[PDB]
């Protein structure tokens, strides 16, 4: 490996061998069907709301999130980079697809598949990833840096449906070597969204954009239809000329054939036919190819950028609504703009690399933080793009001021912005894209007094329940299978209108968003204030026994949606106390004296009673009325955690909080698989895991990272990082269970999982507060 020195990969990048088999992978631990796409994954490409494409560490374009809200795992084998090399003085060169695998059927059988093991590495530090190719049969060593321009405090380039592939080639040998790099792409119009005739009308064209000191050559893969539908638009691939390279292309090869129409050209001398052909296809799949060829002298390096764009302007949801995607603000809505997007990337990628470096540098340069922590911190952000992210720029046929936004809970539980989960998972948005965060919270504010008296069948028990109660915050803002933003509470497994945590978490999120954006946005507090007061006032009515605290009802009525709480719980009770304190402070800011006094009165009574009911001398009891009320809950002081972040001070005595956190570390972490897998949710005082429910026996990744941040703020630095380390290890390490780029909600002691690709572990960003 002599190519690594010619590029700059951070030491904190996650690494794996190209073609590496992983032996220890986990699988779902639930009885019913659950997504398991395997460990062959990688960092995604594509902006927020753009649809994303997961290119895996083996080189394949395999995890397709282009249909917004859906996860489709299938390798489109025509989509590849390939290499040709010939040493000066040899009769023949060698050609190789850079993919550690082969197609399942006979399509593309002429191509040289099965990139060998132990011949290259994949690296990832989201939004960047890299491949290096160090192969005994390839005298010139190659590397690529691939990324999309995901940039904090930037709402423009961050939306773009584009990826850059910056290639570096170096000749460490004593002979001249001819080299070619070829990007192939299938015309994927009709891959989704088209009910019949899936390839019909697809056609490919070549664009040559020549100006002074700029030559771009690109293929635009589209359809003859000018119809404005979810399925129609364009893909583009292309390259920018640099000194010392020549460009060749092939506009049309058949992907539903043996591929030799292309490969006989590339494998001879690495130079394509430059054959244009705009003939539309009928049944055959078609694709395009863009190649560069160059001679490297001994010791010579060359850099060449390729790009990929996709202009699919319309997203459709299962309920029928069609919306324009955010990037259409910048490029247009007609779906004929893929070249413009590609050109912007090829002309500006060096600026974008610097912008990414600028935001990563403050963390990467901090030598007090271990590299493993940086691996997790950056790579967990994959989910912001990969979480079915929807970001609208108008309803088709509709202009408003704002652009509504949603991130999925996950794909198994297909709900937008699940509030009990975003309480943990929304940290990156408030910290790095706060204008999105505030928009999402205003979306929630607008739902507070919505009433839908129509009744739905509750999945868990078969009871009938009212859809949406006035004054209760919704569980979610809809499902991609139905109508995001329009039809809230798509979740029907239980009735969220009786949950005891949603209204408090809502208030805490509002005050968080004010505090973490500088305590300057009084307009945001003004917009949300009525909903905050309504939310707390409705929750107060659920206090049955008049201790000042809402009562959990002994049926799941909070985020731990099978682990029943009854009476006053540490979890909902502490969240309530913190929400009351937050509302007091908002009252002071907005000069609402009567609100300040009322919430101060409620707070003093509830605080007193919480302490009396739950403090046992070592920790806070799980609740007052359950069978295992003395269980040690990892999340017992969630309200105090948020109070620390919101700078609301002590809601509980410092000594008692410190004792509780120490107990949690000693028990839920260190007595669970030697503290190497995170914090188990529930532990009995005798040091054995609480078996009352499956959720008590699970580690929740997002709960554990949040707990780590709580410990960190309280000065328990070693405990904080040790606690988080088990989550990193299970996710990313060779000794873990292979969950990179699909961090799950939970695992059990055997390491098997529930709900891969989950929003909650974005809570790791709470460690950067
Ligand atoms: O993991 C807790 C999380 O569960 C979500 O509900 C799931 C539930 O975990 C699963 O057992 C059931 O089969 O499906 C539902 C989704 O319909 C829930 O959406 C979250 O609020 C909760 O935090
Ligand atoms: Ca009560």
PDB file of C-alpha atoms in Angstrom, residues 291 308 524 536 715:
ATOM      1  CA  UNK A 291     -13.981   6.504 -19.149  1.00  0.00           C
ATOM      2  CA  UNK A 308     -23.190  11.032 -10.335  1.00  0.00           C
ATOM      3  CA  UNK A 524     -39.750  30.436  18.163  1.00  0.00           C
ATOM      4  CA  UNK A 536     -48.611  20.590  30.284  1.00  0.00           C
ATOM      5  CA  UNK A 715     -17.995  14.643  35.546  1.00  0.00           C
TER       6      UNK A 715
END
